[PDB]
Design a binder for these strands. Structure first.
Lengths: 120, 387, 242, 331, 197
RNA sequence: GAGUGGCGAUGAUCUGUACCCCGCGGGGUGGGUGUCGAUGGAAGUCUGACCGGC
RNA sequence: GCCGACAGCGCUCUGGGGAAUUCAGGAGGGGAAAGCAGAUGUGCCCCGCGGCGAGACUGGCGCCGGACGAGCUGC
């Protein structure tokens, strides 16, 4: 069910790096429930999930509402890599990252979901 | 120079001779747009050579599910052997207009003397066909009975369900409306059963003292009839009803032996046994709904039932509408639908969320995962119980 | 604000089949419920009887680009009770339910979606309503559902694609009438994320225009969305119904 | 509507034969007044927008009965060199305009084939026939009529063209398979009647190929036995019947159709000492078959239908007639 | 009966075979069909209980007030009995009151608000004020209410065609009075020729 | 020398169902509830002599 | 909510309204196979031009081309 699977040749790495930079700019909603709140409230600019979920059904619900809100989603293959990409000390299973009016981070979100649009 | 073309529609194939062909250089001209806009001019361009309906909606569903990927069927090759002339590409060919490129290549592959202009390539047959799609209601009305839009609608539900595998794993229906009717008829049997207790109890007082459990009252006042003709152990029933020897039956025949109230008549007793058969058949149907409802819910979404029980899991699935909606809600939104009480309210709300989306988005979901969810519930109950 | 049980009267909107419900401290755009007693995705709705029957689902510009355009001040929406609408990019059938509430029982909505899961919720909603057809196919392949869609009056377009004008281009070249309605939602961040949004909007208008539409008006959806445009145009004629 | 214009072409096209009928002594002048006015009323009715196949057949019936009226009145007044071909050409025009406007009307198509057959227009009949088959390919009426008239004309290859394309198309009902076994065995009846033809494995191929079809059932196989059960004067009818009964008793061996052909199987090549002989042989198969564990009600209804299905024959033992009446009473 | 011709007249059951053919039937299992089928037999059991309850109330009201039954019927008269509570407490009320039984919200709205009082109450669904139309509705509502105070007063203060000796006379007078009200000529109008002469 | 047990994004914690009277225990009214009641209340049961035909 | 002077402004004038009908136009919707691009009776045989087409030879460089032809059919 991971048909937007991100490729380990550095697209995963740019995803997790932009996760970390958004974590340092506090633009980051972590975990599946808070990701779901950000997508349902429409604050979300991009959303990554983790395909290393042991039952992946517990994150399969957010591609629905991301298709409804028309925000790009993409899966990285490790919730541990996403977890310390956030800086959490636990495994983050699905992360959402928003934006503001003016930031270089918002530019990096723009180019990043341009690459996600090249996937989907 | 297009000779024939092929219009494939949700009721069947139909291939048209075209004579007085289109202005292949002046297609974007406004008067040609008018002649491609009204029926009384374009119909001078198109005839109707053949129509081929669908002998069954199964043939329709295989017809979509071949023509979407772009493969012709053996009956389409049949109708084209029927209609097209026997041609190689030796000395005289036949141009056919086809709305699909791979169907064109397969159809020139099967028939060597047809040559097919596809409406993705050439705007001549794209327009000459686009206008058969505009007027193909009136163009087909003389031979196809009934509307085309319903055959389209059913064929689109059929192709969406056959492509997505919809109702093989969508069984939400049988518990939302089922808990609606279950709580509804529980209210009804409380109402009417309280009525028959009020009125036969108006005839015969102390049966309210010996026998509670309203539906067992209703069956025992179906069987006891009148105040007159009593024996305690009459026929094969009261041992299966309740206690017999020391407790109830002597209070029944003794209570009517020392009875106190008003007498009643026969047609009134017909009201109390028609109303009694009302209440006890309502209770039997309640047993049927709880049995098949709990079995079905443990066969469809077991996680909410093991962590909650099928009446309140039924109340949440009817309360949010479907497994897809309740799965789409977050944790605290399910928490919409001292601090220890609200704290464990938040914890069971969160596990009911995780149980909801694990309950829906498996194919035919299992049972032990909700079992280990209730194992976490028991060890958090123990996590407070260390106090 | 718009609490459950507040008295709020309903008057018609300027468009055909669109309603506006004015209350004491607020107003709420709303459509008429085609299947009464049932909310699709859990929305507030309005019940009233003739002087049981009449019901009005409240329609959200934050969950619907078309409600964002109607509250955005759009001249026409091309859709009326009786229309045929080709909806593009139909996730879960929510705005497809509001369009189906506009065109009503005698209308027909032809919902197209690529994803199977929104396909499933679309088959739930489209099993409840009988004027919407479910089509789960690729919008980049209109010859897949050329056996399913007749010549429609309106095309609504909400896809998050970089080749959006090409997709709507070939879909209109197969299914949209002579002088047809087209109503496209555009996300400038989705087409070109490194360009300014007015330039992305004007370039998409130019791609429709050399795709032989005729742009009537453009409005940007910006008290309700950011960097979203709604372009209202008409296929092969300057004036709509022909 | 420009019905006065196009109607004006058809009326002015009709005029010189009315000229010749006025100048011959055949019709009189007020008769031609009624005739021109009624031609006109039909032409405006027919070229009118909202029309019906009933209306087209009304004007065909009236125009053709006009041609017969002028024919008999011509034979009264002993005229010759007046001809019918403007009437026949005109009637082909009414039909061509008819099945151009309402082409999904098998009343129009069968009536136009009837006219084209009654005026001895054979090649044109085949052209109309092919156009009718192309607009109604799921019509066993048309495929049967094309195959049968092709067979009676004598071109069995063209008959088999119409039939094998027919069995390709009409595959819901068994009807056209029954008529192609019926017409192919009609041809084998012609071949053995004139005496490949010695083997005749073609309707056996129709049978064994017909196994794999969506209609293929036991009652339909009993209709195959009703088809093959006639023309018992042949070479290999026992081989064909025997293959049908053998194959049904290899694929559906527990059905009262198979027990019914187990009864009626020795009565194929009969029509006479063998008639009570094979009749009592059918009493051995009958008493052997009615006791068999199967759909006993269906076999009982089939044998009420069959014992009733013999009664019109003469020259029979009245004890056998009465005891089959008592067997109908007993079942 | 579906999942033949006794339940419903034919050629509509041809339509239910037609919609049974071409409909959008989602093939649910026979267990769920057993649940919806047992709800069907539940509600047709309640329809049979409606039939015999209706015959119960008809025969019982014939035994309690035959004057009422031989004016307006068991259901409407039973609802008058149910409003005022009992037979003697229905009999203690005047004929205008028995006209306005069932319309007390509009009635005290009108009387406290200086407006038009309601013409009838429960009475409207009898077999007679429904038979009339126009001003005959309020008029026969009045006189039916007067005759029915009289008849229920006879039943409440004392084979069945001598016990029902008031209701038959009030039926004959009140239905004859009906047809003399309804079958009336219009207002006399002059006829004018082609020239207005 | 071997085999068990161990929080947290698969969601920790915090403002918030009220106030008050007492030694984690108890009590006076909450407000929203969901029931069946109830006799209790809003709450009292139209007008009254002509009209139609001719 | 009716009435409303003076001053000022606008529309209109065989004064201003309402209804009935007769006549003259205009705009829009919906319905309609809504289809007179070349309008020659039918059938057979002989010729002429051509199409399918089994089967058969050949030239030049793995192809392309020539030129034979049972039969069947169109016009």
């Amino acid at each position: 069910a991971a048909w937007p699977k991100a490729e380990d040749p550095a697209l995963v790495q740019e995803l997790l790096d932009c996760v970390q930079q958004a974590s340092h700019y506090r633009q980051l909603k972590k975990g599946a429930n808070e990701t779901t709140k950000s997508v349902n409230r429409g604050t979300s600019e991009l959303v990554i999930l983790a395909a290393d979920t042991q039952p992946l059904s517990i994150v399969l619900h957010i591609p629905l509402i991301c298709e409804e809100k028309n925000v790009p989603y993409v899966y990285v293959p490790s919730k541990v890599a996403l977890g310390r990409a956030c800086g959490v000390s636990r495994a983050v299973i699905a992360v959402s990252l928003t934006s503001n009016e003016a930031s270089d981070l918002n530019s990096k979100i723009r180019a990043l979901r341009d690459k996600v649009e090249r996937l989907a | 120079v297009v000779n024939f073309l092929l219009f494939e529609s949700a009721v069947g194939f139909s291939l048209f001779e075209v004579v007085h062909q289109a202005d292949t250089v002046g297609l974007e001209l406004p008067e040609v747009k008018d002649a491609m806009k009204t029926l009384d001019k374009f119909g001078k361009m198109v005839k109707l050579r053949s129509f081929n309906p669908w002998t069954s909606a199964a043939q329709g569903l295989e017809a979509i599910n071949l023509i979407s990927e772009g493969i012709m069927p053996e009956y389409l090759k049949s109708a084209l052997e029927m209609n097209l002339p026997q041609t190689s590409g030796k000395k005289s060919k036949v141009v056919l207009g086809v709305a699909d490129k791979k169907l064109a290549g397969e159809i020139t592959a099967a028939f060597p003397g047809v040559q097919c202009e596809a409406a993705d390539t050439s705007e001549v047959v794209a327009a000459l066909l686009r206008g058969i799609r505009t007027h193909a209601n009136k163009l087909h009305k003389s031979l196809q009975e009934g509307d085309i839009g319903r055959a389209q609608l059913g064929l689109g539900h059929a192709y969406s369900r056959a492509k997505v595998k919809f109702s093989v794993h969508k069984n939400d229906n049988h518990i939302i409306q089922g808990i609606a009717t279950l709580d509804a008829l529980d209210k009804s049997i409380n109402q009417g059963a309280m009525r028959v207790r009020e009125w036969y109890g108006w005839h015969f007082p102390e049966l309210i003292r010996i026998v509670s459990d309203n539906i067992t009252y209703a069956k025992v006042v179906l069987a006891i009839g009148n105040k007159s003709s009593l024996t305690d152990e009459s026929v094969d029933d009261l041992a299966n009803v309740l206690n017999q020897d020391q407790d109830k039956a002597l209070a029944i025949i003794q209570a009517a032996k020392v009875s106190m109230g008003q007498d009643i008549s026969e047609v009134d007793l017909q009201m109390v046994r028609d109303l009694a058969s009302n209440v006890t058949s309502m209770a039997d149907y309640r047993r049927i709904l709880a049995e098949s409802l709990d079995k079905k819910m443990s066969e469809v979404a077991p996680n909410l039932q093991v962590i909650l029980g099928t009446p309140v899991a039924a109340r949440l699935i009817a309360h949010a509408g479907s497994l897809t909606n309740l799965a789409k809600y977050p944790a605290s939104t399910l928490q919409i639908l001292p601090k220890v009480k609200g704290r464990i309210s938040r914890y069971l709300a969160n596990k009911c969320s995780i149980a909801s989306r694990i309950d829906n988005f498996s194919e035919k979901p299992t049972r032990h995962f909700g079992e280990v969810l209730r194992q976490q519930l028991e060890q958090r109950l123990e996590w407070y119980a260390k106090g | 604000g718009a609490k459950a049980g507040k008295k709020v009267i309903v008057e018609p909107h300027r468009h055909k089949g669109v309603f506006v419900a004015r209350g004491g401290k607020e107003d709420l755009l709303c459509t008429a419920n085609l299947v009464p007693g049932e909310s699709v995705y859990g929305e507030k709705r309005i019940s009233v009887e003739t002087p049981t029957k009449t019901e009005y689902r409240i329609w959200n510009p934050f969950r619907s680009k078309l409600a964002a355009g109607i509250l955005g001040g759009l001249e026409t929406i091309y859709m009326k009770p009786g229309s045929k609408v080709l909806y593009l990019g139909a996730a879960s059938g929510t705005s497809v339910s509001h369009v189906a509430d506009i065109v009503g029982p005698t209308g027909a909505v032809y919902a197209v979606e690529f994803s199977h899961r929104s396909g499933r919720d679309l088959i739930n909603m489209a099993t409840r309503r009988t004027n919407v057809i479910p089509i789960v196919e690729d919008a980049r392949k209109p010859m897949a559902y050329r056996m399913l869609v007749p010549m429609v009056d309106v095309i609504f377009a909400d896809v998050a694609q970089p080749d959006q004008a090409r997709i709507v281009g070939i879909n209109a070249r197969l299914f949209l009438k002579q002088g047809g309605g087209l109503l496209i939602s555009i996300k400038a961040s989705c087409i070109d994320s490194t360009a300014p949004p007015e330039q992305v909007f004007a370039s998409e208008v130019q791609k429709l225009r050399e795709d032989k539409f005729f742009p009537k008006e453009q409005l940007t959806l910006e008290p309700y969305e950011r960097d979203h445009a709604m372009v209202s145009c008409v296929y092969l004629q300057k004036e709509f119904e022909g | 509507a420009w019905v006065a214009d196009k109607a004006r072409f058809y009326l002015e096209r009709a005029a010189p034969e009315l000229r010749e009928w006025e100048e011959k002594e055949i019709f009189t002048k007020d008769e031609i007044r009624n005739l021109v006015a009624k031609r006109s009323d039909f032409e405006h009715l027919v070229l009118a927008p909202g029309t019906k196949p009933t209306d087209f057949l009304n004007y065909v019936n009236w125009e053709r009965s006009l041609d017969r009226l002028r024919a008999k009145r011509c034979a009264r007044l002993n005229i010759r060199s007046v001809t019918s071909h403007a009437s026949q050409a005109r009637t082909f025009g009414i039909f061509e305009r008819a099945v151009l406007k309402h082409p999904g009307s098998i009343e129009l198509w069968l009536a136009y084939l009837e006219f084209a057959a009654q005026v001895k227009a054979t090649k044109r009949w085949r052209r109309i026939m092919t156009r009718a088959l192309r607009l109604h390919p799921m019509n066993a009426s048309l495929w049967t009529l094309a195959g049968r008239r092709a067979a009676q004309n004598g071109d069995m290859q063209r008959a088999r063209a119409h039939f094998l394309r027919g069995c390709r198309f009409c595959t819901r009902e068994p009807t056209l398979w029954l008529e192609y076994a019926r017409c192919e065995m009609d041809w084998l009846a012609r071949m053995e009647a004139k005496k490949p033809a010695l083997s005749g494995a073609i309707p056996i191929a129709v049978f064994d190929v017909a196994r794999k079809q969506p209609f293929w059932g036991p009652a339909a196989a009993e209709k195959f036995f009703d088809v093959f059960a006639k023309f018992g004067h042949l070479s290999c009818h026992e081989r064909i019947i025997s293959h049908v009964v053998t194959t049904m008793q290899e694929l559906f061996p527990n059905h009262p159709c198979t027990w019914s052909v187990h009864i009626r199987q020795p009565l194929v090549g009969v029509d006479t000492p063998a008639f009570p002989k094979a009749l009592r042989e059918s009493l051995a198969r009958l008493k052997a078959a009615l006791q068999s564990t199967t759909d006993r009600k269906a076999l009982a209804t089939k044998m009420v239908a069959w014992m009733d299905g013999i009664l019109a024959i003469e020259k029979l033992d009245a004890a056998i007639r009465t005891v089959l009446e008592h067997t109908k009473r007993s079942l | 009966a579906l999942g033949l011709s006794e339940i419903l007249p034919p050629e509509i059951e041809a339509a239910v075979k037609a919609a049974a053919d071409i409909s959008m039937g989602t093939e649910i299992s026979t267990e769920d069909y057993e649940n919806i089928k047992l709800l069907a037999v539940q509600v047709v059991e309640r329809s049979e209980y409606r039939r015999q309850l209706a015959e119960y109330l008809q025969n019982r009201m014939k035994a309690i007030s035959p004057n009422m039954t031989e004016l307006i019927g068991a259901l409407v008269g039973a609802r008058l009995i149910a409003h005022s509570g009992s037979l003697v407490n229905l009999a203690k009320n005047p004929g205008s009151t028995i006209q306005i039984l069932g319309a007390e919200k509009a009635l005290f709205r009108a009387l406290k608000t200086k407006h038009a009082t309601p013409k009838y109450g429960i009475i409207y669904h009898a077999s007679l004020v429904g038979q009339a139309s126009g001003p005959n509705k309020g008029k026969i509502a009045r006189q039916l209410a007067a005759k029915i105070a009289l008849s229920v007063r006879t039943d409440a203060f004392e084979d069945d065609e001598t016990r029902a000796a008031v209701g038959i006379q009030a039926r004959a007078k009140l239905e004859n009075n009906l047809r003399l009200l309804e079958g009336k000529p219009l207002n006399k109008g002059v006829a004018l020729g082609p020239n207005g002469i």
